[PDB]
Design a protein around this ligand. Structure first.
Ligand SMILES: CCCCCC(=O)N[C@H]1CCOC1=O
Ligand SMILES: CCCCCC(=O)N[C@H]1CCOC1=O
Lengths: 258, 258
């Protein structure tokens, strides 16, 4: 399993708080809960400005297109300008390879050479957005990742909080994915027709295609067709794999009565 | 946020292991990782038999239909019989309200009065499946939940491990949901057409429907239609809400260049 390592320096009190944070994050299912949770654990200073952005990524894990903007406390004026002036294309923070460690904005701003990037930096600055830090995480089996940005003074000064937030970020990302209602990581199974299910029923009992043909009184030609469709609908590699992957269907062919 | 409380009794060593477990669980994206992870942290005794079942739930959080069967170490003979004899409908463990605390099977077996339940108990027993424990968790905004079953001797004797596993279960459940590739918790946004996007572009800049009509040279009648479709596709409550919910579309109308 690919996961950033837990932070080593932490006091027992910090280790507990982080466990609470990650455990709670894993229960977040609504945008409201996520907004409230981000707001809470980043409450002081009340002058900080927070946003989480979920995006579709290229093969370098950089955001290609945003999937969801979850504002916590970015100024609406700034978001308006960011949208209208297409700052996503000029914002050095948007070029980050998601899943690396925290990025203090000046690390990037101090190195920006391009005209559009310099303009963005000046505009950000005049909007009170000149300094900050960004945490990020990316999924392994779906091209999506989130950035968590905190704008404000003295970004990253609290080293332990940075480590804890960095560790928490992947969990905030997964929560963002849940609340964003995206298509599944890989295609869902497709519902079998009754005839495909009847065929799968006998597959699951160890019947050969010919035996199934006999039982259903159709040619094996037809059985083979249905079997191919069952395998496809279950995203299986073969007949035998489909029987394993489709076990849930064979176990509860109808609504369980309670 | 609705979440079972962290366990209080734990030693510092146990508190750390649990953090590692929950943090790692939150990174699981494949069935293989989940199978390997369950196997690992439940390794002794190697005589234990483990399965995770993800299901669609009724309004009492009981499984109505299975969505995925993730076998770790249940005997294949037993799964075969369970499928063929429709034991899902007779298994007292399948009647559990998912999300309660751990269930030692005998708690239920000792109270089972019905003929089919008694038969199931006898069959389970003869297959080495007579004793065990089941952990469970359920989602709040999607009718899905998982049971994690461990069959074996002296179920639940290690109180600290029970507490830690119980705490971990919701996170295993969310991982199961990811790997099962289900439809989103609520419907995904629908892709806007170019014309709907052009309309949303101006919505996002504060243009009224009439102003948009003027800019696009169409009637406001037509604009209203497109606006209704934009609101619907973004699952928004109204025009103004759609502008917030659709901010990602306005911010990255095209692929970001990197
Ligand atoms: C509006 C989404 C912004 C995501 C990336 C980010 O946080 N960028 C910082 C950099 C300075 O101003 C910002 O908005
Ligand atoms: C095959 C899925 C079983 C899920 C529920 C469960 O673990 N039931 C136990 C009870 C005795 O035998 C079993 O299989």
């Amino acid at each position: 399993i690919n996961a950033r390592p837990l932070p080593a320096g932490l006091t027992a009190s910090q280790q507990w708080t982080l466990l609470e944070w990650i455990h709670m994050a894993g229960h977040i299912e609504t945008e409201g809960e996520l907004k409230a949770f981000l707001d809470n654990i980043l409450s002081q200073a009340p002058s900080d400005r927070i946003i989480l952005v979920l995006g579709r990524l290229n093969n370098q894990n950089q955001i290609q297109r945003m999937e969801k903007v979850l504002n916590v406390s970015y100024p609406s004026d700034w978001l308006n300008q960011y949208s209208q002036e297409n700052f996503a294309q000029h914002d050095p923070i948007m070029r980050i390879h998601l899943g690396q460690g925290p990025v203090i904005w000046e690390e990037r701003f101090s190195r920006a050479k391009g005209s559009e990037e310099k303009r963005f930096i000046a505009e950000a600055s005049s909007n009170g957005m000149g300094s900050g830090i960004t945490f990020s995480a990316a999924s392994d089996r779906n091209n999506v990742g989130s950035i968590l940005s905190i704008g404000g003074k003295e970004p990253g000064r609290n080293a332990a909080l940075v480590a804890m937030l960095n560790c928490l970020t992947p969990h905030l990302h997964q929560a963002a994915v849940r609340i964003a209602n995206l298509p599944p990581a890989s295609p869902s199974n497709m519902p079998l027709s009754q005839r495909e299910y009847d065929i799968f029923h006998w597959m699951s009992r160890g019947k050969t295609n010919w035996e199934i043909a006999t039982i259903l009184n159709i040619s094996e030609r037809t059985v083979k067709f249905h079997v191919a469709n069952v395998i496809r609908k279950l995203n299986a590699n073969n007949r035998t794999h489909a029987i394993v992957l489709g076990m849930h269907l064979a176990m509860t062919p109808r609504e369980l009565v309670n």
